[PDB]
């Protein structure tokens, strides 16, 4: 499988969204959970794992429940020293462990710890190029401490950059009609994620996060990322 490039109708249209784009933006505007070297402590459902990670920023949480696509995925990481990175939510995050410190929720984000690093203090840079109305207007670079890394960690870094430079998502709306982030694994494998949120009036956070439960890792020395963008008129 390599799912094809979307043409205009596949793409969610910002002008057709009437809620608060600040709520997409929340998920990306320097927002994320991240832990290096952890083993899970307990589970909720079959197909998710709970860690004590706490909030480095605010005091929002002591416990995180990443939910994965099926229980085999959580069979595998169940007792692994891992690395968590990704984009977390609270509206509608409910899990069960008492055994008031706080709790948050995401999807996926896991990497096996041991092996996946760089053998001093080094990091890894990943170019992203940017296309507005089919023209290449802007290209830039992202960074990470891991070699097989999640497509999620790199989406969050790249949107974090564009929120602030190109104003991808503002509170109200966004300067853009459509937008999709395409990946180019070095084997032809080419997945995308549609960047605008679904049309109407609210936006389900935890349902948009969920495309990530796949835990789709990539390789940070080789991958290529394309952000494809459109503006429409006056």
């Amino acid at each position: 499988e390599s799912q094809p490039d979307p043409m205009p109708d596949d793409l969610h249209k910002s002008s057709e969204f009437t809620g608060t784009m600040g709520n997409m933006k929340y998920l990306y505007d320097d927002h994320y959970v991240s832990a290096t070297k952890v083993k899970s402590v307990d589970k909720f459902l079959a197909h998710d794992l709970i860690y004590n990670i706490s909030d480095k920023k605010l005091k929002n949480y002591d416990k995180v429940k990443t939910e994965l696509l099926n229980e085999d995925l959580a069979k595998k990481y169940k007792d692994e020293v891992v690395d968590v990175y990704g984009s977390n939510y609270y509206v509608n995050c409910y899990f069960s462990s008492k055994d008031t410190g706080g709790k948050t929720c995401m999807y996926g984000g896991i990497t096996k710890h041991e092996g996946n690093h760089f053998d001093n203090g080094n990091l890894q840079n990943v170019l992203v190029r940017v296309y507005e109305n089919k023209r290449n207007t802007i290209s830039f670079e992202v960074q990470t401490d891991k070699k097989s890394v999640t497509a999620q960690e790199l989406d969050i870094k790249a949107r974090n950059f564009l929120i602030n430079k190109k104003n991808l998502y503002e509170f109200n709306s966004s300067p853009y009609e459509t937008g999709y982030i395409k990946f180019i694994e070095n084997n032809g494998n080419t997945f995308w994620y549609d960047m605008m949120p679904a049309p109407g009036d609210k936006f389900d956070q935890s349902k948009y996060l969920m495309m990530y439960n796949d835990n789709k890792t990539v390789d940070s020395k080789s991958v290529k990322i394309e952000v494809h963008l459109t503006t429409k008129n006056g």
Binding site: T20, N23, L58, K59, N60, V91, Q205
Partner: protein, 109 residues
């Protein structure tokens, strides 16, 4: 009693950013920002259903918002203008009951 507003008075300057804070004790999912005007009662500006969520109220132009903690809910005037002067409250609430705080007199010239 249960849902403190910072600042409590505050005059601001034609064209500044004002940020009013609303902090609360009972760890309720829901929170709201109303401006009282006269023969207007509380009209609602923005509300929110938990950390991360904010929705338009009835008068919502002008103002952005943001709920970073459970306990804390901020209203923000993108560019203060005379006509934004008012007395502004928030509330938390589990279901049927609401819980306000005591007002912020904002005066802008």
């Amino acid at each position: 009693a249960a849902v403190t507003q910072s600042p409590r008075n505050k005059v601001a300057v034609t064209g500044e950013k004002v940020t009013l804070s609303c902090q609360q004790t009972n760890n309720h999912n829901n929170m709201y920002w109303y401006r009282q005007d006269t023969g207007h009662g509380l009209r609602l500006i923005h509300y929110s259903y938990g950390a991360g969520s904010t929705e338009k109220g009835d008068i919502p132009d002008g103002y952005k918002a943001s709920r970073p903690s459970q306990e804390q809910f901020s209203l923000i005037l993108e560019s203060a203008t005379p006509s934004q002067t008012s007395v502004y409250f928030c509330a938390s609430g589990g279901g049927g009951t609401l819980y306000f705080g005591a007002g912020t007199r904002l005066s802008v010239l």
